[PDB]
Design a protein around this ligand. Structure first.
Ligand SMILES: Nc1ncnc2c1ncn2[C@@H]1O[C@H](COP(=O)(O)O)[C@@H](O)[C@H]1O
Ligand SMILES: Nc1ncnc2c1ncn2[C@@H]1O[C@H](COP(=O)(O)O)[C@@H](O)[C@H]1O
Lengths: 285, 285
């Protein structure tokens, strides 16, 4: 009947004129929708709750104005609902990986301006145990000028323990020893747009990378591979894709994942792709 | 006649109980010296001025309580003075490269406790044009967890322009193309104690390292070399020692150096070793 949209705003996202961006977005949506409900997040979980309530109320569309944290929550609130509103977002964050993957303008005002209800794309969603992810599941990752970044960073690989991971992926079984495992959905992770160049938002796959490091010396050698973009296995890392899989430890230890930048489920974890799960408003590319 | 010492204190160095460290140092020095003058720095240059005035007054010893900035200034105030007081210091800084090189205790209280006027070492001092350095002259250097350090750092090599440097070292001439040149006095630079493992505080040499990078890809490949400690030239970097030399640009551009963590002289620069220039109180190693 009446086309309705909710606009979920994280006021802590963005900078000084973020409030002005909210006004632009609201007046733009009011041109497109008969009714626009504006909801402001106050704490963790709010965006997820708002998005879910919008789905239960059969709203036409759900829009998020915030960073990746708020976008994840919003998508989490929609995921596997019997009816799912179309999803849109206006990036206010410092990174905005999903925006990059969908070729949205980095500039919020431009993103609002170029919103086209006709311009959509299917969007895979990740599932990890009982939760959802939209960008990445990371395992085991947490005077000299430009050189200091290595002496701090290339070192901090040493601080990274190796684990006996077992990977059960699409009914293929293997045990590895590694300090670092990443599972991504799109080409962009942490603002590095070329990390997974072959990954597409609707290719229906999870993309896994792990380092073949045992020493601090093999981990360091993987760094140029990551910079070039991971599209194949090398001497220093392995690249795999899968639809469904379980990652566990062969010597069970309390190991917690990092999911879209936040502490997530502990191992073991079962990861699944939800292919073409959402309809998202995208760029004109 | 009467043994006199000055204690130069940077109150902005160190943390909460730094004031208490000053008291311990003062009462320790009063056991060792008939007179102790305590001077507190307020701005850049003060430590250098205090140290120089102590030399002109023929004080027996000069002590610095602070970080590398204050130690550099103190040493700069003594350098090439006709009479030079013996030099000591109590590390309060976050890095303290010189302390590491002399095997002083990291802990200030322990450093004060173990001060032995009989335990000394000769100390080379560096000269760059009209100024002095004690650690390093650097040229051209200024969600994913531990991986982000590279994606930030391994990238930031790209932001590093290459320059056509000319090196005139001990009457040997060569032109190189590089983004990064480092000239050090000791084994420790920026808190990385194994960077120049063969350098000794009194070996009478300046130690030069430059990256053989033209691309972002050769610079990255130099990183494991640096981590292992530079004791030889490799496919990715060159290691040289010299006593006197001039570094210039073949296409003159405004390029400023970084000297012991602070902006220093612009190219061209003439670097010289002042071998065994100071007597410094050292560790029991
Ligand atoms: N009103 C608010 N004030 C402060 N922080 C908030 C607010 N609403 C959400 N957050 C937090 O902001 C983070 C998400 O921000 P972002 O990653 O920019 O979307 C989460 O940790 C939320 O708990
Ligand atoms: N009283 C003071 N208050 C604030 N900063 C100071 C003071 N005295 C010296 N400094 C600065 O502290 C720096 C040196 O600190 P450090 O590297 O810890 O020895 C230099 O930039 C000085 O200008």
């Amino acid at each position: 009947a009446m086309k309705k949209a909710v606009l979920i705003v994280n006021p802590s996202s963005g900078g000084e004129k973020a409030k002005e961006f909210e006004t632009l977005a609201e007046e733009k949506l009011k041109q497109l929708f008969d009714e626009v409900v504006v909801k402001q997040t106050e704490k963790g979980g709010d965006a997820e709750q708002f998005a879910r309530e919008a789905a239960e109320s059969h709203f036409d569309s759900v829009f998020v104005m915030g960073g990746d944290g708020t976008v994840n929550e919003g998508i989490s609130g929609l995921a596997e609902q019997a009816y799912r509103p179309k999803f849109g977002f206006f990036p206010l964050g410092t990174v905005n990986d999903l925006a990059r993957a969908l070729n949205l303008p980095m500039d919020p005002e431009e993103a609002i301006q170029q919103l086209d209800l006709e311009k959509t794309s299917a969007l895979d969603v990740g599932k990890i145990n009982d939760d959802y992810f939209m960008n990445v599941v990371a395992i085991g990752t947490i005077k000299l000028g430009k050189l200091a970044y290595f002496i701090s960073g290339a070192k901090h690989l040493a601080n990274a323990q190796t684990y006996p991971f077992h990977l059960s992926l699409d009914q293929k079984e293997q045990t590895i020893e590694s300090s670092t495992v990443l599972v991504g959905l799109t080409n962009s992770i942490g603002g590095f747009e070329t990390l997974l160049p072959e990954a597409q938002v609707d290719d229906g796959k999870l993309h896994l990378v792990y380092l073949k490091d045992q020493s601090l010396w093999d981990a360091v050698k993987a760094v140029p591979d990551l910079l070039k973009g991971v599209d194949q296995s090398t001497d220093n890392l392995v690249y795999l894709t899968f639809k469904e899989g379980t990652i566990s430890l062969e010597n069970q230890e309390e190991l917690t994942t990092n999911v879209d930048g936040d502490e997530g489920a502990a191992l073991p974890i079962t990861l699944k792709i939800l292919p073409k799960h959402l309809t998202v408003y995208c760029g004109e590319e």
